[PDB]
Symmetry: C4
Subunit: 121 residues, 4 copies
């Protein structure tokens, strides 16, 4: 992904397998979320080892929490697209990849999920 | 994959590690199947959180079941290619990736498998 | 990988985590090998579900066995390169990816390994 | 990655899940590090099975140890960028991918991390 020409000047921040329990469905279900945020090196290269010099990666879990807390989600696309739109709404974000999946959708499958990858023009 | 130019306007629906037991071989054997379906955002962006607004991802498991139920499969290519052809036969599908594998083909390997990735022109 | 332009008309045959025990080192050690073979669809699309219609994927494990059986291997590159050269030496092979790794090289790492990816011109 | 045009003439050396314990934070924490080093085939193709013919892959763990041993690291970017700069500082290295992650950053996530991928011009 960091080989893509629009992303070659970026670092990747990533959140792996963030689980939440929520009401979702077209009791609560487990949903597993993965996020990749692409932020420019020129905006996120610390030279004083200070948090203010980078994009705080706590924004990924915060954005998922905000989206899940809105309630009333039926489709995985609704949640996935909302997390991606939230995370794109930041000046220092160039691109985002978000997947959601339901490990318990089917007894004979590990998961079924939805993924988007959005890059700013 | 969603960086590929023909897929940049798509979301990815995915089915991870769908296991089936079937007669296959050039008793039943376990076969593990993975599917990625690429569907255009323009056709699958819900604005009312309704299932009719998207491509129902149950189509992946349904298509595998239909193919496995035909019986008389000897080669992994026969099954893999049939699942891919079935899933391409939908107006809102742009591309599909399908892999099949046999975890028990060899005692000293985790799996041997076959994968195809087909994109509509 | 099947999005690469030279590989778009290929299927991928794969062998996941083939373990062998052998003398290797610059008692026996465990080495884990992964192989991807890219073969043209035009040469490997069965229409009669017969093995003669495809490239038999047993060739991957056979080639690893032949290379390991030669003995006297010190470097991972020597083994990896030999497996790749063996598997390229077939008319219906367009490309091969081979990795070798040593899970026990270091107590505080899962593995250290070497990978090559060779495509015929 | 070995399909990328600048890397097509390279092999990949890789270190998977190197764990360290260190003080890091914007007691010690566990940090998991992954490294991919791209080195030209023309510089690393052994024909006599001798270590002097290749880039010794012990350099990856050595460089991580040197960086961790400097102490006083607050941000993951500081560590990740330092490992990448160290490993690029070798004539036979064409590119490097380095990720760091903290498995224990959040109770409901497997990890949060940072990755860079640097290629020499
Ligand atoms: N695409 C899609 N299909 C479904 N089928 C059942 N639930 C869903 C969902 O959330 N999204
Ligand atoms: N390519 C291929 N080789 C095999 N060798 C044994 N079974 C098979 C199969 O299903 N496909
Ligand atoms: N590149 C490389 N470095 C090593 N250092 C120790 N063993 C090896 C090996 O097999 N290959
Ligand atoms: N990007 C980034 N955000 C953080 N938030 C808390 N620690 C860190 C860190 O090391 N890097």
């Amino acid at each position: 992904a960091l080989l893509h020409p629009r992303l070659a000047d970026c670092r990747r921040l990533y959140l792996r397998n963030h689980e939440v329990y929520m009401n979702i469905g077209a009791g609560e279900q487990r949903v597993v979320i993965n996020v990749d945020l692409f932020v420019p090196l020129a905006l996120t290269t610390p030279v004083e080892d200070k948090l203010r010099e980078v994009v705080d990666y706590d924004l990924m879990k915060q954005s998922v929490a905000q989206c899940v807390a809105r309630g009333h989600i039926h489709l995985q696309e609704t949640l996935c697209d909302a997390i991606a739109a939230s995370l794109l709404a930041h000046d220092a974000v160039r691109a985002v990849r978000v997947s959601t999946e339901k490990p318990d959708a089917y007894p004979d499958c590990d998961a079924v999920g939805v993924e988007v990858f959005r890059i700013k023009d």
